Write a protein that binds this ligand. Structure first.
Ligand SMILES: Nc1ncnc2c1ncn2[C@@H]1O[C@H](CSCC[C@H](N)C(=O)O)[C@@H](O)[C@H]1O
Length: 316
């Protein structure tokens, strides 16, 4: 069972974590792994080998935070390391449903693609809804004065905090709660990698929560959004016969009443049982002429042929 491990950044000095992050930056994601990079790739490691790379203090920091577990003879990590877009991130290893804990954290399935779709501009205050590992928040922290990440999974909140400390980031905060409840005030930027995929209307789990989580999100967005703010959402959308997602969305957003502009970029689609249609896409709320537009953008395809330059893309 994966994703129930205890994560406790609060039990380590901020400096020790910052140094560990420095060490990880040198090796995570690079060829010829050192013992630290081996540890964070899921390989058990002799602790004296770690000692020479992170110090005995670093070694004790790894234990105290929950990043490492002492199997007597060796150390092992329940987490896996990533490095991308200027940040080091720990998350759960990519494993199948049957062995996931209820607090399993998104193992960065779509993060790198999503970061590349995001408008490159920065601003005053950003919100990362369902922050998971915290990866989107950490990237946003570089160009926002402050960033709040929220999740209902307490373990995601702890991991997010740890990941911010590892990167020595000071302007990013994380709170446990349900949707917007722990997010006070308005935001000039809201990003939401939604937990929607194949489940349609039905709650399966925190990573497939059903369409209602989008309804809640979009019904409340208008009161959480600063004038001129931007909203970006990864989501799965179900068009049913005589019942397109986009009409439900416009209803939720009070589109004309609140005077918002929404663009939906569809990347993938398939026919469904109903004679309806499933789609995956990227939704953007941004200042301009009121209304809703649908465009095609096979960014998943383009990401596969050449990741390194979708790019963005939406700025257009
Ligand atoms: N009611 C709710 N309130 C806040 N977050 C929720 C929620 N229901 C599900 N979530 C969270 O939404 C996230 C979706 S996965 C997104 C994770 C992260 N932003 C990434 O891009 O990798 C999960 O972390 C899940 O725990």
């Amino acid at each position: 069972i994966v994703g129930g491990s205890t994560i406790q950044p609060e039990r380590v000095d901020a400096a020790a974590l910052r140094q560990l992050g420095d060490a990880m930056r040198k090796v995570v994601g690079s060829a010829d792994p050192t013992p630290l990079a081996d540890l964070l790739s899921g390989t058990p490691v002799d602790p004296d080998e770690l000692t020479r790379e992170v110090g005995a203090d670093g070694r004790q920091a790894l234990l105290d935070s929950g990043m490492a577990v002492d199997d007597g003879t060796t150390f092992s990590s329940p987490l896996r390391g990533h490095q991308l877009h200027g940040v080091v991130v720990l998350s759960d290893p990519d494993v199948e449903e049957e062995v996931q804990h209820r607090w399993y954290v998104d193992p960065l399935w779509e993060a790198d693609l999503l970061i590349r779709l995001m408008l490159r501009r920065g601003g005053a205050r950003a919100l990362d809804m369902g922050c998971g590992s915290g990866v989107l928040s950490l990237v946003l922290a570089d160009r926002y004065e402050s960033v709040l990440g929220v999740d209902v999974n307490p373990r995601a909140v702890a991991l997010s905090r740890l990941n911010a400390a590892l990167n020595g980031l000071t302007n990013v905060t994380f709170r446990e709660g349900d949707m917007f409840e722990p997010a006070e005030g308005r935001f000039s930027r809201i990003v939401f990698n939604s937990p929607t995929n194949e489940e349609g209307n039905e709650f399966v789990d925190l990573l497939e929560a059903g369409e209602p989580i989008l309804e809640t999100f979009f019904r409340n967005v208008p009161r959480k959004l600063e004038s001129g703010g931007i909203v970006e959402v990864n989501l799965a959308m179900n068009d049913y016969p005589g019942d397109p997602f986009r009409e439900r969305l416009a209803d939720w957003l009070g589109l004309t009443e609140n005077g918002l502009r929404v663009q939906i970029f569809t990347s993938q689609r398939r026919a469904t049982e109903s004679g309806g249609e499933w789609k995956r896409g990227w939704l953007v709320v941004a200042p301009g002429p009121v209304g809703l537009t649908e465009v095609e953008w096979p960014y998943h395809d383009r990401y596969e042929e050449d990741p390194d330059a979708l790019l963005d893309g939406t700025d257009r």
